[PDB]
């Protein structure tokens, strides 16, 4: 069965860039019809969709963060890598990686990791 | 964004109570895809509604939903101690693939 | 007196000719809209049986009779299937059902374990366990009486009035017909060649009298050319012989 | 309530040839002095009608039904009171019950749990009574009931000199159960053989049963060692047949002729006449029928690969 | 028996029937007037369509003439609409022979993709290969039978 | 705006070139069948007079529009002759006409002295009486509003 696990640094300097990984285990991402996306929720406010990638190498990013984020996949090790740039204290949030389908928008969510900005 | 949702709703255990998520009809479009998730603290949320008045495997029959003209209403019957959580609305939109709903916390006594 | 919504009664009406004109013509009936049939073609439609459902409900819960409607009345108290054929009539019943100080003889069920299939009736009023802990004896924690009496009195506002709702249901031609519409007779002719239809048969031959006697079963007559030459007069039971002009 | 009479004095069934019975009015139409050919469900002439006689002696078992029946009762003292019909008669399938014992005619279609030997008489009194009136002990789920006006009947227990003969036809047109009736008085013929008579028969009633029916029993009217009155009843069967009927000037059936019984009757029917002249006449075609049937197809199994075509990703 | 498969928009499924005209019934898939067998079509929106849209599906728009029934081959050479000779890249009076789809879950009916399978065969003239399920019996001889 | 059933609007078309392909473009024209001519051959024929009529009815009464059928809308409001030439087109408009609060500007007749021949109007709204008692003024018993 599928577990979504997030890994990466929690404290980041604002000038420095951020990298994050989600090591999904339990589905082959190459199956036709399944995607995977990223959702962040800053404390005190609602969630925020980041981006999502498809099985056949089709990538969809957020309307504002096209340059900020980049996504890539590795089905051999069953991992996905996301890169975020020039983050802000408002951007500090809990991050989740999630399976995505068409009928059911989002079904299973990873436990997530906190991200905060300081020195 | 341009989508809203009332945050707090209150009721009494053993009875039925409802909350709604509301937005603009143009952004969500003709096709609804109304969805609702629950989130108690200290672990990740899961899905309880994926289609109009529809619930996947691992059912909880007390759940119910209904899609009005511009809103989606979630109704709960026979409340117990598990209601004290935050419930998020989520619908497909046209100009972007956004939901951006605040979520609905529940109160009971 | 009508039955409760959770304990309604259903009666079978058949083997008769129903005059739907007077029921449609009676003023204080409000709801009249038929889905599987026409609201005026009830005088030329034949069915194996007609199913009638009568009960008293609140005015605020009348619109939930339609298929696919969900609600407190529409999930625990009364249900209809998703392929309903027929129509319902509803009207105000605060004039008669309600008392001077409020008639509390009308009740409805509140708490149930699950949702039952359409057209199922239950009478037990045992307390439902809201919580996970079983309870026994009398009313206590996590379980209470699943029935609450209606509060229906004339001084109540709009929407509090009890409404009497009736349901007309019938099957569409899968058994010998029993309920059919009425017919009307106009004018009469004797020994003359005119255009007329008798019992579904057109005829223009003159009806006459002859030594023949029709047996109590005999009703029609033909000739060498296999064309109509004798019928029973619908108006009076006299013997007739038919031949054209 | 029932009594196990047992001690079944079951004699071999009687068989009689049916000379001219089974004719009635097929249509509700008036025809005057016309020879008319028709085809329907009929009882062929000289067929083996099954006859049971009750007198100690008691012969009224269940009998198999098939596609309409012709019932004849030869009586003088009103012994036979009704009929049993159906397929299983064992509280699981609806079954026909007709009774005319005392007050009215009653007809029901219900799944009764009949006992081993239900009966109405078997009574000590010579005049006797309807002992064990409710022959059926239960009625599980049935709503097919009716009661109507009585029929001509007799009184007291009398044996011999049968002066009444009631002939009914019970036909099943696609579940529609139609009862037609006729009665002949002043029968001086001995009950041993069917009399030489031709009589038209009249229509009465139709009913919507629409049920599986394949066997039947009669109903007639202390049990251990009782001598009953003579009771003769005949049952015959029907099948698709074609006849020719002769109407008179009044409009009543006076004679009928079969068309597929004998070559002489065949040539009588094919000429729309009843008599014929000397000579040669051409008649129906002559053909045979197959003894069985055979089929042949390639012997392979190799299930077709449909699923992956539709389920292709 | 042979089957044909593709994905077409639901707004043009009516063109599959013989005797129709249109963009796809003239330049993509023409069905002969005399046709045996039949076609099966159903909605496929949960699988084929994508939230950001699907663009890997192509359909021809321009051809010099209506193609004969049951044509399968495709040529991706450049097309010129006007009389001006055209080479290299397209442009004025030069239109690319094909075009893509766009499928969103937010689209209404008549735009979601559909999956279509077409069956056609001839009837009992050659030794048959595909046959239905039925028991085989013994071959009797010299007797009136029903074969 | 489309007028009511009893007030169908008649339109004149004359001296212009007609293309029916633009009619086919709109998706919800799922009810398109013609009697006197084949629908696919309208592009190579000439006419002498054309008429267009528009109104809105219930979904279940569209089948009643075709000539021959007996009923309420086809005997009291608008009907076609048995030898009618032409055809009808219908499509869903709940997105436009239907309202959450309810659009109540569409009416129709239930009661009339007798049925009427095809292709005329009936505007008078005098109440219809069924009983022998002469009903004057406003609605009473056995005398109701036709609309
Ligand atoms: C009505 O029910 C009877 C009772 O079963 C059916 O009779 C069966 O007929 C088949 C025909 O091959 C026999 O194999 C069975 O043995 C019969 N039943 C019994 C108990 O012997 C009859 O076919 C049914 N008719 C219909 C129309 O359903
Ligand atoms: C007659 O005896 C049999 C035993 O074979 C029994 O089954 C049946 O019930 C008895 N009849 C009655 C009326 O009890
Ligand atoms: C018919 O009955 C006669 C006696 O009445 C008998 O000899 C003959 O065998 C019977 N035949 C059939 C087929 O029942
Ligand atoms: C009938 O008579 C017999 C003996 O004469 C007796 O045993 C039996 O009880 C009697 N039954 C009735 C109902 O009189």
Residue numbers in the entry:
A (entry chain H): 1 to 119
B (entry chain L): 2 to 6, 8 to 111
C (entry chain B): 343 to 587
D (entry chain A): 14 to 68, 75 to 240, 251 to 342
E (entry chain A): 392 to 538
F (entry chain C): 343 to 489
Question: What did the article's authors report about this structure?
Answer:
By contrast, each of the complex structures for XGv289, XGv282 and XGv265 showed only one configuration, in which three XGv289 Fabs bound to two up and one down RBDs; three XGv282 Fabs bound to one up and two down RBDs; two XGv265 Fabs bound to an S trimer with one down and one up RBD, although the XGv265-bound up RBD conformation was weakly resolved and therefore not modelled. Overall XGv289, XGv282 and XGv265 bind patches surrounding the right shoulder of RBD with various orientations, but in a manner similar to those observed for LY-CoV1404, BD-812 and REGN10987—antibodies that are known to generally neutralize most VOCs with high potency—but showing decreased, to varying degrees, binding and neutralizing activities against Omicron owing to the presence of new N440K and G446S mutations. Notably, XGv265 and REGN10987 recognize almost the same epitopes, and both have almost no neutralizing activity against Omicron, despite retaining weak binding. In addition, the mutation E484A breaks the hydrogen bond with R74 from XGv282 HCDR2 and losses of charge interactions between R346 and K444 on WT RBD, and D56 and D58 on XGv265 LCDR2 owing to conformational alterations, further decreasing the binding of XGv282 and XGv265 to the Omicron S, respectively. Together, G446S, acting as a critical mutation site, can alter the local conformation at the binding interface, conferring greater resistance to a class of antibodies bound at the right shoulder of the RBD. A single dose of XGv289, XGv265, XGv347, XGv052 or antibody cocktails of XGv282 and XGv347 or XGv052 and XGv289 resulted in a complete clearance of viral particles in the lungs.
